[PDB]
Structures are given as C-alpha cells and as structure tokens.
C-alpha cells in the first residue's frame, strides 16, 4: 500500500485482527527464548506495534484511510495488545460483549467509543452537540443502572425517569440492519446518512418519539422509519 | 349504608332532594380526592 500511498493515490487499508499480529510475534519470542512479559507476551511488543502502525500514516504525498480490527482476549481491555493498539488510532470503537447479547447486533459502546474529529469545527457544530448529548444520555444510565436493577424505574426522579428511558431508546435506536446480515437475518440493510442520523438523534432528544414504545427502535434506519413503522401499527 | 338505603328510599322527591345528595345539572365544576402514602419505595403504587 505504501507504493500507491507514495504516488498520491488514496488507499482504503483494512487489516483485520491486528491482535493476531501480536499473538503471532508473542508466540515467535517465546520460541525465541526471549523474556516473557505480562501475560506471556514478548518483551517487544511497543516496538513492534510501533514499527507496524507508524507505517499506516497519511503522509504530504498521499493519504491512507486505515481500518483496522481488534481481537481483545476473553472479554479483557486491559490486555497488553489492545492496550498497546488503543494509543494509535485516531477514531475507536468499542463492541461490547453484552451489547451484543442484547441483540444489539452493532454492538458498539458509545461511552467505551470516542473519536479525534469529533468537533465542531471539523464535524459540524449540530453534530457534536448531538453526539455530546447522546454520550451525556446513557451516561446518566450507567450511573443508574445498578439503582435501576436493585430497586426499578420507580424510585428515580422525573427528569431521570424520562432520560432514563430515553437512554433505553437511544440504546435500542442505535442498532442497524447491515446489507452483509442477510444471511442469517431476514431484515433488508438500510444505509442512513450522517445528516440523517444527526437530525433523527435531535428530534429523539427533542422529546419527539418519547410517545413511541422502545421495541420500535429495534433494528431501524432513521427516525421516519421508526415513525412509519408506529404509524403502521398504529 | 343501610341507613342511606333506608332513609334515601323515603326521600324520593326531587325538590327535598337538595343540599348534598341533590344531582346538579350541568355540571360546570369537579373536585376530586388523591390519597398516596407519605413515603415512597411503594413500587408502582404511587405512579398508578
């Protein structure tokens, strides 16, 4: 890549599973006779993600739109490798292992993913202030969350009775049908713009669709489909 | 109650019908009474 990189071309990189990288160098060392570290792994293991990941930069001469995948061990962020991969990313997204089993096939941990361009000046300034409250909603339900399963909805306030279930809408709107699913689900995939889901995260922030039950958000593209589908059901 | 079923049975008519058992006509104004617990942690109680 680093050949059409070099010559201007812009270059789409998708490696995937850079943790296997880091296992295969670990388990290399440990033939070699080096030091183990930490769990088991090579003593080199800042340098040689160094080595690989400085290598995926856009440079003055072309640009590199890099995508890479992390296999985290178990369920452990606090492994060397994605601890080691975090420090060189631009944008990171984190899929967590309840979302999913939640059937939130996405899966992503909005507070757990963050991004460098998410800023007004390079994003749009409606953009960022959705995002901000999208991550201010469901932080306030993670704080809750332990009241929530010991003692219920009841007990919260109004306010936070209403974010909290905003929070629950917000979480179940995020899933997405994806064209790649059609093999095992029966859902057709659905493309939503970034204009379109900014303006349909405001509206649901708005208040707007606090009316509709949170099972209307499963598995939906922007909000007019959420919309049609109430109306369809009346 | 069964004084109210004994004594309202012999007041049938609607001119000694008046004070509080009288049935206004168009009615312009309701009042009406809540009583909820003093305490929360009741569960649904309160909400319902």
């Known amino acids: ?87 060189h990313l631009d944008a990171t997204i984190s899929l967590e292992r309840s979302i999913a089993e939640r059937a939130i096939f996405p899966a992503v941990d909005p507070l757990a993913s963050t991004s460098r361009i998410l800023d007004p000046n390079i994003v749009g300034e409606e953009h960022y202030r959705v995002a901000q409250e999208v991550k201010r909603v469901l932080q306030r339900y993670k704080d809750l969350k332990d009241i929530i399963a010991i003692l219920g909805m009841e007990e919260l306030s109004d306010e936070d009775k209403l974010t909290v279930q905003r929070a629950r809408k917000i979480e179940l709107f995020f899933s997405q049908p994806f064209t790649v699913a059609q093999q095992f689900t029966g859902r057709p995939g659905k493309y939503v713009p970034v204009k379109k889901t900014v303006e349909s995260f405001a509206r649901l922030l708005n208040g707007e669709g606090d009316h509709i039950p949170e099972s209307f958000f499963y598995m939906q593209g922007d909000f007019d489909d959420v919309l049609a589908a109430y109306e369809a059901s009346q | 109650r069964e004084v109210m079923a004994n004594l309202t049975a012999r007041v049938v008519g609607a001119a000694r019908r008046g004070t509080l058992l009288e049935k206004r006509e168009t009615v312009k104004s309701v009042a009406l009474l809540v009583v909820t617990p003093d305490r929360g942690l009741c569960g649904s109680l309160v909400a319902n």
């Open chain 1, 1 to 87: 890549a680093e050949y059409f990189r070099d010559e201007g071309r812009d270059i789409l990189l998708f490696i995937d599973n850079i943790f296997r990288f880091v296992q295969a160098g670990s388990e290399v060392s440990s033939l070699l006779g080096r030091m183990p570290s930490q769990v088991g792994y090579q003593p080199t293991l800042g340098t040689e993600m160094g080595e690989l990941q400085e290598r995926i930069t856009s440079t003055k001469r072309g640009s590199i739109t890099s995508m890479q995948a992390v296999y985290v061990p178990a369920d452990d962020y606090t492994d060397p490798a994605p601890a080691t991969v975090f420090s």
